[PDB]
Amino acid sequence: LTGGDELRDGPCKPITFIFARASTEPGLLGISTGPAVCNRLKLARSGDVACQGVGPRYTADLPSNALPEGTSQAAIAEAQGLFEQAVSKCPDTQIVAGGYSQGTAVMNGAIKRLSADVQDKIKGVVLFGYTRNAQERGQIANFPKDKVKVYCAVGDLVCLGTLIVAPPHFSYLSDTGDASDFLLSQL
Predict the structure, then answer these.
(1) Where in the sequence is the active site?
(2) Are 172 and 153 in contact (CB under 8 A)?
């Protein structure tokens, strides 16, 4: 009945969407792009999607953006554990994933650390306002470029190797349909 913990709650679904929210967002999926994409996936594949947010160890606090990899080690470990848990708990699931702002740093840090076998189960990843875009040359490290789509709005300065938050950083509602479409196409 409540959202964002559907991998931990079970039952397994054919599609598991794992999402890391932006700094300051409450809850597991957050309150912006994470639910927007989750809900689009559920409309397109009714009854086939589990949405799982990265939390609560990932606290989405502002200061963590300045740490080496752009988020906390705890957040990266939590996300990495959820990818591993999807594959072991639900061997038939196909994973799609995403993040927003700091959550994109969580995704990059976690996915780059996964084995090839678990990476192969992750069919697509959408990154809105990717805070590691410059640092990672527009992809996730140690993971295929063609499985990632980055949404960096014009003038969203966090994609330029800064932590400056400007208005285009909040313009991603208009990209959530494209993002859902990309994830569905990868599935």
Answers:
(1) 101 (nucleophile), 156, 169 (proton donor/acceptor)
(2) yes
Annotated active-site residue 146? The verdict is: no
- Note if 101 is an active site residue: yes
- Separation of alpha carbons 157 and 72, rounded Å: 21
Active-site residue flag, 180: no
> Could you tell me the CATH number of the domain that includes residue 81?
3.40.50.1820
Range of the domain at 16: 1-187
3-class secondary structure, 89: helix
φ, ψ for residue 68, nearest 5 deg: -40, -55
Q: Which two tokens stand for residue 41?
A: 């996936």
Marked catalytic residue, from 23, 64, 72, 101: 101
Pick the closest to residue 131 from 105, 149, 154 (CA basis): 105
- Active-site hit among 23, 72, 169, 175: 169
Q: Which of 23, 64, 72, 156 is catalytic?
A: 156
DSSP 104-173: HHHHHHHHTTS-HHHHTTEEEEEEES-TTTTTTTTS-TTS-GGGEEEE--TT-GGGGT-----GGGG-GG
Place of tokens 């569905």: 184
Partners of 100 in the beta sheet? 128
